[PDB]
Paper text:
FANCM is involved in eukaryotic DNA-damage recognition and activates the Fanconi anemia (FA) pathway through complex formation. MHF is one of the FANCM-associating components and contains a histone-fold DNA-binding domain. MHF stabilizes FANCM and promotes its DNA-binding activity.
Unexpectedly, structure determination revealed that one of the crystals contained the FANCM–MHF complex but that the other two contained the MHF complex without FANCM. It contained one FANCM–MHF heteropentamer in the asymmetric unit, with FANCM asymmetrically bound to the MHF heterotetramer. We could model most of MHF and FANCM except for the N-terminal 13 residues. FANCM interacts with MHF through an extensive surface area of more than 5000 Å2. The interaction is formed by hydrogen bonding, salt bridges and hydrophobic interactions.
Author numbering:
A (entry chain B): 8 to 82
B (entry chain A): 7 to 102
C (entry chain E): 673 to 804
D (entry chain C): 12 to 103
E (entry chain D): 9 to 82
Write the structure that this text describes.
């Protein structure tokens, strides 16, 4: 799998503005899958950009190229 | 966590996100036959950390908007409402 | 009795996972590469609740969202998450800007809209003349 | 219809030029006609994004009428944008 | 800046459902939000032109500012 449920809850409560805010188990498991989808999307887009430039190593420029459109799909 | 002495928790969560990003990037590398640079994995980890901050703020404001203190499946659906593939997958997995 | 998944039921890394992250992914003093950092949000017209807690944010590589503007006129494929209307609107303006970079689409945009300007819709102001 | 869209675009274009004139005289710069036309198109497309989110935000709170709290929910990501508008909402 | 009635036309133009309506307070807030968005775009593009020591703002400065601009307002 990917992220553990406890890591997602710790990461979300780090940025929660209020202390009374809580997350249900189903929503916590949904966010762990959503983060895994985001990581795979970024890595796959950067890797296919390296493939389109015929490069077997994904560097920082391939992440920078796909990044603007990538962030705009997850806003 | 708030305004003082929370950098250690941030570094630990950063390292955890970095490890998970590297583990997922290795599977993507197996699937597409490429190799990811160290700096590339660190960049994807930083993007994921800040996107997690955005997601946490969105979920909390969506839950508070519906007069609720518990973030539920409706908040995650409202977060993924924008993309057809991201929204229907949630409906595929949030119900399941 | 599972020693591997025993040490990680928690939120942080297990001692076995911290070893993997340290050797393979952690950027160290040995790594002659700069740390990747996303730029912060900063408004020019609003009071900035300052996120300036990191004055070290130039010993690193700031990920530029505009260094590859010429590539941004067409969609950048997709693995599993399709592009959004927010993204398509951004691609359209970039395509518009590159059409206007060739002198063409810039003057015509103002031209095609002026017959449709209903004054009752706008707040009339004085043409100060600071448009070239 | 397309005529209604062009009518709204021309209004956004003129308003964008008037606001760019205020920013231009604050910094002593000149805005190109290409620059204001580009910013006007961004503003027009941003209105669609705002409208679509507000409608879905209202349905999230079991409402068909968009209120001021939905406008506040648009700025949920930036603190500086969140403290603004909220202070403008309280003062109206 | 923007008039209240035109903002109501801009929002109604993109509503997917017919029962959706907008309150007067939200319309006045949206007119302010749109004015801030235009002024933010112009101020950021001008600041890029100033960084290049140019008192004339071209579309090159819009490309430098557009991605972060869309990501800051959501």
């Amino acid at each position: 799998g990917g992220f553990r449920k406890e890591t997602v809850e710790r990461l979300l409560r780090l940025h929660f503005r209020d202390g009374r805010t809580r997350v249900n188990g189903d929503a916590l498991l949904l966010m762990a899958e959503l983060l895994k989808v985001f990581v795979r999307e970024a890595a796959a887009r950067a890797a296919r950009q390296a493939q389109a430039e015929d490069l077997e190593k994904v560097d920082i420029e391939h992440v920078e190229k796909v990044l603007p459109q990538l962030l705009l799909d997850f806003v | 966590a708030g305004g003082e002495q929370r950098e250690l928790l941030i570094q630990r969560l950063r390292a955890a996100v970095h490890y998970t990003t590297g583990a997922l990037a290795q599977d993507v590398a197996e699937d597409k036959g490429v190799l990811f640079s160290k700096q590339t994995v660190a960049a994807i980890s930083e993007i994921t950390f800040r996107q997690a901050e955005n997601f946490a703020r969105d979920l909390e404001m969506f839950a508070r908007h519906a007069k609720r203190s518990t973030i539920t499946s409706e908040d995650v659906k409202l977060l993924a409402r924008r993309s057809n593939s991201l929204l229907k997958y949630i409906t595929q997995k949030s119900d399941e | 009795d599972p020693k591997e998944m025993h040490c990680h039921e928690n939120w942080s890394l297990s001692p076995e996972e911290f070893e993997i992250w340290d050797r393979l992914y952690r950027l160290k003093e040995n790594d002659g590469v700069k740390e990747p950092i996303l730029p912060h949000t900063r408004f020019e017209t609003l009071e900035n609740l300052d996120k300036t807690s990191k004055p070290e944010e130039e010993a690193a590589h700031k990920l530029s969202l505009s260094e590859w503007s010429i590539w941004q006129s067409r969609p950048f494929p997709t693995s599993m998450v399709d592009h959004s209307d927010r993204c398509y609107h951004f691609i359209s303006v970039m395509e518009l800007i590159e059409v206007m970079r060739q002198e063409q689409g810039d003057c015509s945009y103002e031209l095609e809209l002026q017959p449709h300007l209903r004054i009752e819709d706008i707040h009339v102001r004085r043409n100060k003349g600071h448009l070239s």
